[PDB]
Amino acid sequence: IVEGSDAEIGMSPWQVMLFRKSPQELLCGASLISDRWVLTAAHCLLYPPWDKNFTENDLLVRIGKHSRTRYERNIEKISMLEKIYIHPRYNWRENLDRDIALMKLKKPVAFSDYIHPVCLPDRETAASLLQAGYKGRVTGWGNLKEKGQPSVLQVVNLPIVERPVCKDSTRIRITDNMFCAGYKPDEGKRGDACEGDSGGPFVMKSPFNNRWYQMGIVSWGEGCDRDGKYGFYTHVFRLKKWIQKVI
Amino acid sequence: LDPRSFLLRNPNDKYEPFW
Amino acid sequence: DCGLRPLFEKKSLEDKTERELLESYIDGR
């Protein structure tokens, strides 16, 4: 995350780190939606033109983290995936359309102060909050630009941008399963997701029940925090039937 | 087309990151 | 009991920026 801040302890208890077994290494972000499932971007597990195609075992899921590096001895939990499900119609060929994936953790993920699931939106919740101008929050241990990579979870709030502005910011074909966010050129401020933040949740707090909902998944961008450019996110609510289904 | 790449207009491809 | 943070909502504590969050939906100042 660019132009963010260090997260507070227990601010994002659903935040999950996708960790490379060997070479050990941070893959992407993710989110806990149940006590056995994890949400993330399909392209964190499957990107052929770059020969990326991780299996259930080349992987490890780390929950309740704060420090990007350290093994947080009695607060973090590690698990192994029992299976991965990529959206059958994920388009890594055209523009990262339907960039989604679940991970039936193989062993339960007992919760605690730093481990708690985020809510998945309902048609009405999505309806009232997914509006240009409404701010959302993205977290990740991503790049601090285009100490380049942080030491503790980063966080930043970004307004939703109207589809037309989003479309004429790029030459890639935007679909209905995406939405973009960030401040405008003139707005007089920045911030953005960046490399390493992918698969990370984009959340909003519902002013009606005072609950946090995952509206999107960090998918792609064009550079990091450049003027006239925006971050693209998977539209979680439009892909919800697919989610219920594999669950 | 990940966050860290660039524009597709004339040049129809790209390279992976590093570092 | 999803979306309710044990260290913030469950104890009635607000994080230092969820405030700049709630203010966007109604429009502050």
Side-chain angles (χ1 to χ4, degrees), chain A residues 8-9 11 13-14 112-113 116-117 119 134-135 137 157 204-205 210 212, chain C residues 1-10 15-18 20-21 24-25:
Chain A
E8 327 246 68
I9 302 293
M11 205 188 200
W14 34 81
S112 244
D113 273 34
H116 223 89
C119 301
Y134 298 25
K135 281 180 174 217
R137 191 146 85 192
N157 321 313
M204 286 175 130
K205 168 167 241 203
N210 111 88
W212 287 92
Chain C
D1 145 89
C2 72
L4 228 107
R5 294 181 315 195
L7 230 70
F8 279 63
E9 267 47 302
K10 268 181 120 146
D15 76 54
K16 121 231 271 80
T17 58
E18 66 164 275
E20 144 200 342
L21 214 31
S24 52
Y25 308 124

Side-chain angles (χ1 to χ4, degrees), chain A residues 118-161:
Chain A
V118 75
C119 301
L120 275 185
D122 9 298
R123 192 245 186 301
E124 15 217 85
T125 273
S128 1
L129 299 167
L130 264 212
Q131 272 203 21
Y134 298 25
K135 281 180 174 217
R137 191 146 85 192
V138 213
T139 33
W141 293 277
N143 278 14
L144 292 146
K145 260 251 192 207
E146 196 161 310
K147 229 271 194 198
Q149 256 205 89
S151 46
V152 7
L153 191 82
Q154 288 306 99
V155 69
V156 70
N157 321 313
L158 295 160
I160 308 220
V161 193

Side-chain angles (χ1 to χ4, degrees), chain A residues 5-55:
Chain A
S5 210
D6 315 21
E8 327 246 68
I9 302 293
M11 205 188 200
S12 217
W14 34 81
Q15 184 74 33
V16 174
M17 158 166 331
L18 281 201
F19 194 73
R20 188 99 84 124
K21 219 117 105 138
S22 194
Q24 308 168 134
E25 232 194 358
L26 192 137
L27 246 125
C28 281
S31 64
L32 190 70
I33 64 166
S34 78
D35 75 286
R36 15 229 270 194
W37 288 78
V38 182
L39 235 137
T40 183
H43 92 209
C44 284
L45 306 181
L46 174 56
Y47 201 50
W50 281 352
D51 306 5
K52 332 185 331 198
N53 175 11
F54 301 139
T55 272

Side-chain angles (χ1 to χ4, degrees), chain B residues 3-15:
Chain B
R4 20 95 126 128
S5 334
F6 240 92
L7 66 107
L8 69 144
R9 197 50 241 131
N10 263 46
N12 190 184
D13 29 50
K14 211 52 53 171
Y15 320 46

